[PDB]
Structure formats: structure tokens, C-alpha cells
Design a protein around this ligand. Structure first.
Ligand SMILES: Nc1ccc(CC(=O)N(Cc2ccc(N)cc2)C[C@H]2C[NH2+]CC=C(COC(=O)c3ccc(Br)cc3)C2)cc1
Ligand SMILES: Nc1ccc(CC(=O)N(Cc2ccc(N)cc2)C[C@H]2C[NH2+]CC=C(CO)C2)cc1
Ligand SMILES: O=C(O)c1ccc(Br)cc1
Ligand SMILES: [Cl-]
Length: 330
């Protein structure tokens, strides 16, 4: 089997991407944030505290003839930005772009934190990291991809995120028309439960390539590119007027600037992020200072290849017995 679904930026800055997902019978379509950095499929629901729902589409398990309460199962997740959500668990039929999994754990939110409430465009998350990070207790549950894997033509999914435009998530096949050149594959460590890999270096604009190992995760659920302070300083040093602002929480730059590109290495291959991809617009409405798309990971403990990087590439998440990651230009 295979599936193919369009993923769409939620706003003009590509702050996140949403992908329609069918849950239950008859289908209830929710727009989920596919997140290769986490491992729960959780949704706004009829059980979510009313005051914490503001425009989201909800899953109502009582209206699904295939929904079954998973007795005693609960979930609770907190994230690095202080956000959180929690609730109970149903099993139900879930379909993505024509690919169907029966008996998928659908984690129904009873509580969500304000940052989720405030994002009306995102109805939940679909985690695509390894199932070892799934939070359901006392019996851990599998991700949509793990559940689908055996049925897929090939045990892979691909992320093809657009810049200021829709893109595609494919399951079970590689669309050879979706990239240029070849796909370069690189080793993955699953020890921490992430798609963790090592970039071979970087360049800023037309500058010389610096060969250096940068360990990080491929994370479609993170908007920006988070890299070591040395790398980030070298990038912003090429932008007149750019500075690290403590009050704003990162590097900012004059909105009048044209940004240099940023290149990262994948083995002997190179992915080039155009400068425009690194502009995240005014720091506050009407400001002439803009927020940078490359920020320091210094306070994280890991580097994060988020959407800013991933959208410059066609990315293969290879879930074979020994997982790997592939990157192609496009
Ligand atoms: N107290 C705390 C600290 C860290 C964590 C990891 C965490 O937040 N994780 C890993 C994880 C995986 C599985 C599960 N069951 C739970 C979490 C979520 C990731 C999911 N991807 C999208 C978004 C993410 C959130 O990033 C940020 O907050 C962030 C903040 C500052 C900077 Br500089 C860069 C990014 C990354 C969670 C809580
Ligand atoms: N300082 C900071 C804050 C948050 C992060 C994570 C991150 O990237 N996001 C939050 C998040 C949290 C948890 C999950 N599981 C998925 C996404 C995405 C949001 C980033 N802010 C832009 C506006 C948004 C929506 O309008 C997108 C990174 C750095
Ligand atoms: O804020 C943090 O400490 C953090 C955020 C994301 C990830 Br992945 C790991 C750590
Ligand atoms: Cl300002």
C-alpha cells in the first residue's frame, strides 16, 4: 500500500504545516501537524475542556462506530516551550492520503495548554519519531507509521515541504519526479528515539564549506533551524545590523536586508537553503526588525534541523530494519 497527502503552511511565514487526516467512521477530517520529532497522535476532541478550544476541529469518538476506548490508558506530554497536553485514548481507523490503519491509538485531549488553544489552524499532532517515545501509559502505543510499515510497498515516508506553498507527505514510496540529482543517505541513531543524524558541515552564502560534524534531529514539527552558537554567529555576522537580542529571544535583523543562503552537508552532498527561507518577518506587528530563521541550539542540548532546513530538500525517512535518512535537492 501507499498514501499521499498534501501538506499546507498554516500562515504566510510557514510557521507550521497542516495535513488532513481522516479519523473514525464515518470519517472525521482533522488537520494535523505531522511531527517527526515526537511520537503521539493526539487530537482536540469533544472531551477537551471547552475554554481550551478556540476554533479547532474536534474528534468526537462517540460519533465513530469504530472508536473503542482503550481502558485505563492515558497520555500526557510536555514540550520544551512549556506547552503541554493530556487525555485519554481510543483506538480507531485512521487514514492519511488513502493509506489506512485500523486500530490506531488516537489520543484524545482532555487538556491543552494556551499555545495550542491559540493556534486555531492545528487540530492536533501526528508523531512520526520512534514509538519508544510514545507517552501512553501504562501500555505504550505505536505511531501511525509503525502501524502502517509492514503494509507499505517500501518501509519509508517522505517529507517534501514547500516554501510559501503546499508540499507533500508520501508513505510507502519515493516519488522520483519530486527531486533533482540523487538522494544521499546518511546514518541514523535511534538511541534517543529521534531521527538523529550527523551533518558533515556548512557554508554561509558563497563562503567556503566548513567540514565539521553537527549531530542533530530531523524535525518537521520545529519551524526553525537550531545550530551550534559558533555556526549561528558565523551566519549572522554576514548580515549588516543583525544581532542577538536577549529581549526578543534570538537573532534579529533589519527587515530591509537580503539574507545570504545557508548550506548544510549530507555526506559529500550539499543542501542549499535560500536566504529568503531564513526570514521570519517582523518581531512584532509593524516592526522593522525581523526574526531570524537560524537560531542557536546552545540551550537545548541538541541541534534541530527543523522546517527551515527540511523545506530546502526532499527528505526520505527510511524505516527499514536499520533506519536511515535521505536528502535530495529539489
Ligand atoms: N521540558 C522539556 C524540554 C524538552 C522537551 C523535548 C521536546 O520538546 N520534544 C521532544 C519530545 C519527544 C517525544 C515526547 N514524548 C516528548 C518530547 C518535542 C519536539 C517535537 N518536535 C516539534 C517541537 C519540539 C519542541 O521544541 C521546543 O520546545 C524548542 C524549545 C527551544 C529551542 Br532553542 C528549540 C526547540 C521538539 C520536552 C520537555
Ligand atoms: N522558542 C521556541 C518555541 C517553540 C519551538 C518549537 C516549534 O517550532 N513550534 C512549537 C511546537 C511545540 C511542540 C510541538 N510538538 C510542535 C511545535 C512551532 C511554532 C513555532 N513558533 C511559530 C509559531 C507556530 C504556530 O503559529 C509554530 C521552538 C522554539
Ligand atoms: O528546550 C529544550 O531543552 C529542548 C527542546 C527541544 C528538544 Br528536541 C530538546 C530539548
Ligand atoms: Cl521594534
Amino acid at each position: 500500500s501507499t498514501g499521499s497527502a498534501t501538506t499546507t503552511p498554516i500562515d504566510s511565514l510557514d510557521d507550521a504545516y497542516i495535513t488532513p487526516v481522516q479519523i473514525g467512521t464515518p470519517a472525521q477530517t482533522l488537520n494535523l501537524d505531522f511531527d517527526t520529532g515526537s511520537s503521539d497522535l493526539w487530537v482536540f476532541s469533544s472531551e477537551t475542556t471547552a475554554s481550551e478550544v478556540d476554533g479547532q476541529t474536534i474528534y468526537t469518538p462517540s460519533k465513530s462506530t469504530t472508536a473503542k476506548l482503550l481502558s485505563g490508558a492515558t497520555w500526557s506530554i510536555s514540550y520544551g516551550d512549556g506547552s503541554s497536553s493530556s487525555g485519554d485514548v481510543y483506538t480507531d481507523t485512521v487514514s492519511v492520503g488513502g493509506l489506512t490503519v485500523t486500530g490506531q491509538a488516537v489520543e484524545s485531549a482532555k487538556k491543552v495548554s494556551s499555545s495550542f488553544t491559540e493556534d486555531s489552524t492545528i487540530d492536533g499532532l501526528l508523531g512520526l519519531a520512534f514509538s519508544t517515545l510514545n507517552t501512553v501509559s501504562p501500555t505504550q502505543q505505536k505511531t501511525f507509521f509503525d502501524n502502517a510499515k509492514a503494509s507499505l510497498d517500501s518501509p519509508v515516508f517522505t517529507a517534501d515541504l514547500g516554501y510559501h506553498a503546499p508540499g507533500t507527505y508520501n508513505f510507502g514510496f519515493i516519488d522520483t519526479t519530486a527531486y533533482t540529482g540523487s538522494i544521499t543517505y546518511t546514518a541514523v541513531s535511534t538511541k534517543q528515539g529521534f531521527w538523529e543524524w550527523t551533518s558533515t558541515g556548512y557554508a554561509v552564502g558563497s563562503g567556503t564549506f566548513k567540514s565539521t560534524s553537527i549531530d542533530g534531529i530531523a524535525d518537521t514539527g520545529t519551524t526553525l533551524l537550531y545550530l551550534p552558537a559558533t555556526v549561528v554567529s558565523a551566519y549572522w555576522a554576514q548580515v549588516s545590523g543583525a544581532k542577538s537580542s536577549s529581549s526578543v529571544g534570538g537573532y534579529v535583523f533589519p527587515c530591509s536586508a537580503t539574507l545570504p543562503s545557508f548550506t548544510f552537508g549530507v555526506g559529500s552532498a550539499r543542501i542549499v537553503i535560500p536566504g529568503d527561507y531564513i526570514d521570519f518577518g517582523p518581531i512584532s506587528t509593524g516592526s522593522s526588525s525581523c526574526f531570524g530563521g537560524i537560531q542557536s541550539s546552545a540551550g537545548i542540548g541538541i541541534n534541530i534541523f527543523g522546517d527551515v532546513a527540511l523545506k530546502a530538500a526532499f527528505v526520505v525517512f527510511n524505516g527499514a530494519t536499520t533506519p536511515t535518512l535521505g536528502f535530495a535537492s529539489k
